[PDB]
């Protein structure tokens, strides 16, 4: 189970709960555009460890996204701290 | 040793690819013209020191140094046109 929060204007995010079938870069954009349906989105960005915004724009981009993520979320656990979400802010 | 993380800015943007060990100076090349449209100079950057990677020596020392490193989990590097 991952955990996908979407960051919407004006104080929210909305949380999509993905289960395991490839996730696709383009199925992120879906469900964006059915979140935000007056945003035009292309993209999506992330933070990095180095507090950075990443910008994502494909399939590879996403994977390298993912394997950062997957990698927080198992040191977290280990090291007995709160597990987040993968947050993400659409983008133009 | 696991895949490296490389971070590209262009045009104030910032993307992260990840390259299978050991990683070629060429595809590091071929990623930049595909994802970005054109050749890009490599200029990996430390703050306010940044060197070009000319070679796959370069490529070689850059990823030393990420390697040594207790902090670094990426490799910066700036793009800019020849």
Same mark, same amino acid.
């Given at each position: 189970? *991952?955990?996908?929060?979407?960051?919407?204007?004006?104080?929210?995010?909305?949380?999509?709960?993905?289960?395991?079938?490839? *996730?696709?870069?383009?199925?992120?954009?879906?469900?964006?555009?059915?979140?935000?349906?007056?945003?035009?989105?292309?993209?999506?960005?992330?933070?990095?460890?180095?507090?950075?915004?990443?910008?994502?724009?494909?399939?590879?981009?996403?994977?390298?996204?993912?394997?950062?993520?997957?990698?927080?979320?198992?040191?977290?656990?280990?090291?007995?701290? *709160?597990?987040?979400?993968?947050?993400?802010?659409?983008?133009? | 040793?696991?895949? @490296?993380?490389?971070?590209?800015?262009?045009?104030?943007?910032?993307?992260?690819?990840?390259?299978?060990?050991?990683?070629?100076?060429?595809? @590091?090349?071929?990623? @930049?013209?595909? @994802?970005?449209?054109?050749?890009?100079?490599?200029?990996?950057?430390?703050?306010?020191?940044?060197?070009?990677?000319?070679?796959?020596?370069?490529?070689?020392?850059?990823?030393?140094?990420?390697?040594?490193?207790?902090?670094?989990?990426?490799?910066?590097?700036?793009?800019?046109?020849?």
């Amino acid at each position: 189970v *991952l955990v996908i929060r979407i960051k919407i204007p004006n104080s929210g995010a909305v949380d999509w709960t993905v289960h395991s079938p490839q *996730l696709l870069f383009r199925d992120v954009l879906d469900v964006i555009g059915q979140v935000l349906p007056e945003a035009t989105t292309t993209a999506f960005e992330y933070e990095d460890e180095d507090g950075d915004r990443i910008t994502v724009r494909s399939d590879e981009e996403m994977k390298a996204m993912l394997s950062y993520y997957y990698s927080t979320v198992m040191e977290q656990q280990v090291n007995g701290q *709160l597990i987040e979400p993968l947050q993400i802010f659409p983008r133009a | 040793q696991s895949d @490296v993380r490389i971070k590209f800015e262009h045009n104030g943007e910032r993307r992260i690819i990840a390259f299978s060990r050991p990683v070629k100076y060429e595809d @590091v090349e071929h990623k @930049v013209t595909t @994802v970005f449209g054109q050749p890009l100079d490599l200029h990996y950057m430390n703050n306010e020191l940044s060197i070009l990677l000319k070679n796959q020596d370069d490529l070689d020392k850059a990823i030393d140094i990420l390697d040594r490193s207790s902090s670094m989990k990426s490799l910066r590097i700036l793009l800019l046109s020849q």
